[PDB]
Subunit: 298 residues, 4 copies
């Protein structure tokens, strides 16, 4: 099973003029690796892929892969609506040394099932890298159903997992039973912090979730506890994880909130975010702080 465990969707740190902030992104990467994460995911939703141009995304990916320098597995999010660009970004990720790509379904047009299968097959065929699918139906408007994901894993042996970002036990349970039932080493990762624990108990493989940026230790230690068979300890971590997503209501998009939390939790990076997101206002920053303090995270 590839890409299991705790794999943060790393925030992309930008300077005040919206350029890649290399020292801050580097320091964040180093923080997370030192926290004991099982891999790093660049250019996910939290990484602001959808607010970035293709050349910017290539620059960020190359920078990130190079800085990680093989210390942990690296995933690059290469998806979007422009399928020709997805191939280009995916081939580029492979050339630059990524260990895998994560590919959402096209989220403007909700393409017919035949076009959607064809799309993922074509992307998968464009690289020799492992491909993780990315389901986020609240944003895409089109669910990657367990049956379809199983069909995609039957069709291409390099389609080897899914980040399933959805507040639904049922969807995770059914993703696991359907796809892992036919493909035992297919990887199932939840995209929300407060689903990590259930995803493990259900027989899935970990999480790619926002709190990996600012409190990776909670997920890392939950996974470690769980793997040690200390379920009670794991449940204790889960109890923090259950509360964390309160903070994501502070704004939409909440990429600003995540970066503000990285600062409050002890890593001073620029919190600039790209339009149409915007800076978090002071009242909400203090709110975020009180939440982090209540959870003993800063």
């Amino acid at each position: 099973a590839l890409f299991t465990g705790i794999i943060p969707p790393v925030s992309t740190i930008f300077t005040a003029d919206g350029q890649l902030d290399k020292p801050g992104t580097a320091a964040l990467i180093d923080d997370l690796i030192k926290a004991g994460v099982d891999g790093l995911f660049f250019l996910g939703s939290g990484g602001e892929f959808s607010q970035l141009g293709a050349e910017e995304r290539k620059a960020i990916a190359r920078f990130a892969i190079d800085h990680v320098d093989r210390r942990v597995p690296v995933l690059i999010g290469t998806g979007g609506t422009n399928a020709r660009e997805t191939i280009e970004l995916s081939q580029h990720a492979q050339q630059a040394g990524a260990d895998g790509i994560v590919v959402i379904n096209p989220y403007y047009w909700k393409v017919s099932e035949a076009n959607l299968i064809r799309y993922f097959e074509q992307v998968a065929d464009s690289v020799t890298l492992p491909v993780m699918l990315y389901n986020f139906p609240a944003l895409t408007g089109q669910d990657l159903t367990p049956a379809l994901v199983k069909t995609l894993a039957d069709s291409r042996s390099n389609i080897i997992g899914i980040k399933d970002t959805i507040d639904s036990v049922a969807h995770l349970r059914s993703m696991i039973h359907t796809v892992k039932g036919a493909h035992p080493h297919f990887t199932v990762l939840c995209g929300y912090d407060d689903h990590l624990f259930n995803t493990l108990l259900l027989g899935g493989d970990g999480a790619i979730s926002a709190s990996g940026n600012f409190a990776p230790q909670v997920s890392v230690n939950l996974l470690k506890a769980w793997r040690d068979g200390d379920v009670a300890k794991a449940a204790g971590y889960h109890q923090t994880l259950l509360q964390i997503p309160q903070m994501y209501q502070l704004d939409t998009p909440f990429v600003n909130v995540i970066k503000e939390a990285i600062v409050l939790c002890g890593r001073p990076v620029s919190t600039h975010v790209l339009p149409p997101a915007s800076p978090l206002d002071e009242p909400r920053k203090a709110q975020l702080k009180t939440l982090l303090q209540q959870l003993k995270l800063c």
Copy 2:
């Protein structure tokens, strides 16, 4: 009132290797102008803006505007999820000679109302061109409500209309009452063929709809009949427009169907569409042809 009447969302004609087909796109543009349309809208949904890169979009807009050569007003669709790219595409449109830009709401993240207002304001402030809003909630997952549109038209004097793409009489009626009630010259255009007649009877201003590519005469003659007070004639065109959208069920996306209909209706252009769309298969092309024959369109 700016940009009223029948303004097709012009198909972008591509060669087999996916490049701008300049002779074919020119020929289509000339066809529509000589059919009597009131304006031309490039790089809408039907123009495949979301499957194109930014440089590609710039080249297509420049070519298109240049070929129209001021014979009719030209709109350029500049929207996306990358707000910095929206500004750059909009400023480019303006420098390239466009008459207006058409801006959809960001369709990945459904940004908070505050961010959404700020986004459109920023875009409007980046140009001195008129700005048309674009509502397509089936695709975007976020409705531009009549109240929100009113608030945008109240905030910025260059936000002067909307393409409201929705199968909903209520939405069109409410957009008209709420926005045109406060701003008599704000332009309301429907984005669907079969809502043109109702839009006119409701006090709105016309349509930007797919059949403008392959049967502009139906909409052009409907509008003329309407303005002439020949309601019965208008209704007869309406009856054809009511039936046309059957064909869009043949695939999703249906940009392929639109281009196949351009060919069937007398204009031999390449029908290549960009991934993740795909060629219409021969059985469905034959269906399409039967429909178009039944409607007396070819």
Copy 3:
């Protein structure tokens, strides 16, 4: 084709203690018959079926059929969630002299397709009367799709029409092509005022819509004009019908709005509605009046 033309969903007039108001309901029935409607529909949504007990519904239907005294065809809405009660109400309708029953899908549980087909087949088999389906997905949360309605019409020869209450030209168009294409005399009636014209132009059969209560002459004259081939005149009535549904935004449920409009349009019936609906407040009644005045309806 059975039950075509203009068939109002008649308001049930109650006294202040919530009992059936026989003189008010009789006077309303007689007004509608005198206006030239083609049938009358009791205990639809606008008749408050879902706020009434079964014995009250039986009393209402009995009274209504008896007062109509075969002057026009009579439909009784017999639907709900309690399927045994639907059979009872539908058998009672038949015994009481109704010309047909209107049956919505169960709207609590959204029952599986097999359960749904079996439900309708069992209801249809409990009576020898014609059965009109009723689709109101905004309220039911489960659409009767054209394919499913075709399947029901293919299964039972007494399932002979549908009231399709949905603000969607596509749904109406497709209901007509799919069902009427297989069953030319299957009846298609829209449930919204502003879709009657389009329904007629699309090849469907008329409307069962709230304004039949207070302005039946609009729909009646529209249908007559249409049948006479005077399309311009029909479109002129359509223009009024396009504007009427503004008033339904005044409250939810808007049964109160409809009875307040019957009064304002010149028939003084009691406007009591059953909980959880409530009386329309005076400022909104005055807005209603202004509306009706602007439309030349009172």
Copy 4:
């Protein structure tokens, strides 16, 4: 805090002619009480309220309250669309000796917020019994949001809890923060088996869930372990609860499944269900059996 802990939504056992099976319903009640449940809830969605007439529901409720004979607190489901009937059923519950009522929002019309509050205020005013609200937005089409529920708890001192049936950690979390934050003893209960453990860890109070019928011991022992501070033991029960809901996919409605499971788990009751539900077929009964065997439940 009232009605905390494990409170099954009890199946109503019917004979083959669809009458109340008193010996079977009595035996099931006695099994649940013996299993250590903290209360019993009759005529919830699982008790088939929506397929029963009012007099039927009165007779069931009276039978049930009588048979419980005050051994544990008894809740009666008195909701529906007929608001006058809700008051009648609720006053009847009170007279018959119930300890509280559980009241869903009206689920045909989605009544305005003003009408909704008024509805719940009027039912709460009709009885001196504690009222539990019942949120089931997948069926009702109208969410009882934490803000609204807080407004209801501020308005009436006998509105003292909620059954929150939704597959959503966020909703449960926010219900708890918002309502219990203002009303510490307001009761929050989840309606799904696989949310019990999270509900407890979030600060809620228990569950009313389907598996309380055929495996009450899992929930009872999870609650006991949690209250004992034996989190690891609670998590082990949770793991069973995570898997149980697979069986509810077997049919819709799945009231048949729950009753088949009561049989398989050792209590021979008639499994008859009311239309429009229908008997579970043998293949699916066997599937249920294999699931229950895998979970060590039969």
